[PDB]
Design a protein around this ligand. Structure first.
Ligand SMILES: Nc1ncnc2c1ncn2[C@@H]1O[C@H](COP(=O)(O)OP(=O)(O)O)[C@@H](O)[C@H]1O
Ligand SMILES: Nc1ncnc2c1ncn2[C@@H]1O[C@H](COP(=O)(O)OP(=O)(O)O)[C@@H](O)[C@H]1O
Lengths: 256, 253
């Protein structure tokens, strides 16, 4: 049977429970915070589980649990590798580059002084984002100011400022299919071009269930971010697609 | 040519430079803190580099650079996957479990209350370590002490050790030396075999495997991605640096 791992119940999780009940798909709810994860001994709460859907709000918690499941030999929708490859912007941009996919000119610095040289070499304005878990720099003074105020110790994610003739698009990918999209809201009727780029980006980080955010730039479509635990409460009505049901079925088909 | 990535120069790095010079192995030093890492455009400092040895003291820095090198299509000794699989104790224990290797009974909690239940279920005394260093005597001590590593508690059983801790230096598919954490521990087929498998379990490459000689036999404790060896060279009389440089150079691409 299917196991839905969670910590805080959001409308998205609520919708997941309801669809599984209507679909007649065997499952059980598993509250992670209280789950004993001892290597070598399967917990009572996991008795009879053949596949799991990792739905925790906390990234660190969700990744730790996903890793435990792989140790118990239970398949988990969105493998550890995918979850970490997504929550780390530098990890994600590196994967898109290796896969030869289009994205904004991007760079990384490991100290404050090097960050400045790059921003200067890029030319203002420029953007700076946190590597884990959002600001346009106007000039050198603003740069210095922002830079002053685990594996993510002193890292600076620098990106070019993109001019956008169109609105940002968000595509919901399930396995090898793009099933819905929106303008970040109106429904964005999927086109073969958008669908194609989205699936490749999903594949570039390892496959699974992700939401790909794109920019409609003057250079064309560019990949911006890839999320490992997509939110969709509003998107269901906006697009009219049964996002939760598609997610549950995909997961169930990997049962082992 | 080979590229040695570094930030702070320690005796270990000093020894690496010297051995490369004596071996007649083409290389160049690369100061990471000042290296421009822009996706899509290879830096001047990397011109002519066919393979790299990641030697930064900072983990976050070393891992970020190793990733960049994979994007430029340059092989790096100790791939990103190995580096992170090593610097994360929960990640490393999970990998040893999947490979069916012996280790101390281990568990992980995601909140303070669950940590206590486990310590209690394990029985005192118990050990607690940072995921990325303290023995708990009883419940009172437990209560007192209590990015992707937010609020995680690594709990391990207290192991009785009739022997001394051993450290093995693994290069590829070979265990080349060992020591008692110091005397030289003449490698035995048993120790060498367990060490190579642990190295393979996290992805392979160049690592140091620390073992416990417990009452249940040999148990794997930790696997380090950037092994230190200045003292070990004399203690064991083995050319650790030269073995490391050759291994890397053989992966040239
Ligand atoms: N490099 C960039 N150039 C111009 N605008 C950007 C850039 N990166 C992000 N933005 C803008 O920042 C906002 C959201 O940024 P982001 O941190 O990437 O999160 P998300 O896109 O998932 O909401 C959007 O309005 C987006 O268009
Ligand atoms: N589970 C354990 N039981 C008893 N002693 C331990 C245990 N884990 C670690 N130690 C002791 O802790 C010290 C070092 O611990 P550790 O954090 O694993 O780093 P390292 O072994 O790489 O030096 C050693 O004296 C070791 O024997």
């Amino acid at each position: 049977m299917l196991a839905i791992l969670y910590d805080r119940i959001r409308p998205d999780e609520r919708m997941l429970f309801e669809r599984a009940e209507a679909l007649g798909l065997p499952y059980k709810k598993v509250y992670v915070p209280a789950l004993p994860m001892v290597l070598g001994e399967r917990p009572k709460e996991l008795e009879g589980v053949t596949v799991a859907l990792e739905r925790c709000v906390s990234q660190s918690r969700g990744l730790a649990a996903a890793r435990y499941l792989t140790a118990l030999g239970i398949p988990v929708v969105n493998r550890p590798e995918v979850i970490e490859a997504c929550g780390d912007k530098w990890a994600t941009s590196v994967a898109l580059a290796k896969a030869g996919l289009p994205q904004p000119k991007t760079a990384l610095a490991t100290d404050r002084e090097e960050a400045l040289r790059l921003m200067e070499a890029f030319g203002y304005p420029v953007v700076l984002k946190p590597v884990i878990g959002x600001x346009x720099x106007x000039x050198x003074x603003x740069x210095x100011x922002x830079x002053x105020x685990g594996f993510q110790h002193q890292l600076f994610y620098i990106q070019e400022y993109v001019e956008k003739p169109g609105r940002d698009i968000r595509v919901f990918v399930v396995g090898e299919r793009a099933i819905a999209a929106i303008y970040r809201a109106e429904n964005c009727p999927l086109t073969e071009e958008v669908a194609r780029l989205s699936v490749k980006a999903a594949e570039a980080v390892g496959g699974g269930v992700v939401a790909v955010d794109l920019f409609e730039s003057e250079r064309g479509l560019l990949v911006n971010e890839v999320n490992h635990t997509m939110e969709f409460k509003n998107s269901v009505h906006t697009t009219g697609v049964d996002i939760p049901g598609e997610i549950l079925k995909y997961a169930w088909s990997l049962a082992s």
